[PDB]
Amino acid sequence: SMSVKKPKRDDSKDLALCSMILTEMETHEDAWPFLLPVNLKLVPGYKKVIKKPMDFSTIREKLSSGQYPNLETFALDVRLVFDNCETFNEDDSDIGRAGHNMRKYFEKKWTDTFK
Numbered sequence: 001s002m003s004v005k006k007p008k009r010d011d012s013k014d015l016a017l018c019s020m021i022l023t024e025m026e027t028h029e030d031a032w033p034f035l036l037p038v039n040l041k042l043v044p045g046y047k048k049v050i051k052k053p054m055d056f057s058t059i060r061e062k063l064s065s066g067q068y069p070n071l072e073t074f075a076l077d078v079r080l081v082f083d084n085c086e087t088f089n090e091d092d093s094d095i096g097r098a099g100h101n102m103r104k105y106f107e108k109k110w111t112d113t114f115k
């Protein structure tokens with residue numbers, strides 16, 4: 001509270017570390033459904049169903065331009081990619097499996113790096 005400061009974690013390396021994690025996701029072989037925005041003109045249903053589209057290239061642009069206030073907002077956008085994937089794809093599909101794989105991959109990197 002006012003004038004009562006909690007010790008806080010050193011956050012000076014957060015930007016660099018999120019960038020490295022995002023690089024590892026960008027170069028994963030199962031990243032292909034997530035590298036660019038879904039084409040809302042060509043994919044039926046996506047625009048109406050998925051209220052907040054997100055993809056790795058958009059996360060990279062936001063990270064590179066100071067649009068994440070902290071590392072938690074970065075993780076929220078990453079998880080949004082995989083939550084959108086589950087909403088729109090059957091678990092059994094190639095894209096559905098890719099999303100579950102990438103989520104697992106991310107969360108381990110996240111835990112190992114920050115927790």
Ligand SMILES: Nc1ccc2[nH]ncc2c1
Pocket residue numbers: 038043088089095
């Ligand atoms: N053609 C095609 C098939 C499955 C898809 N999931 N998301 C986009 C998309 C496009």
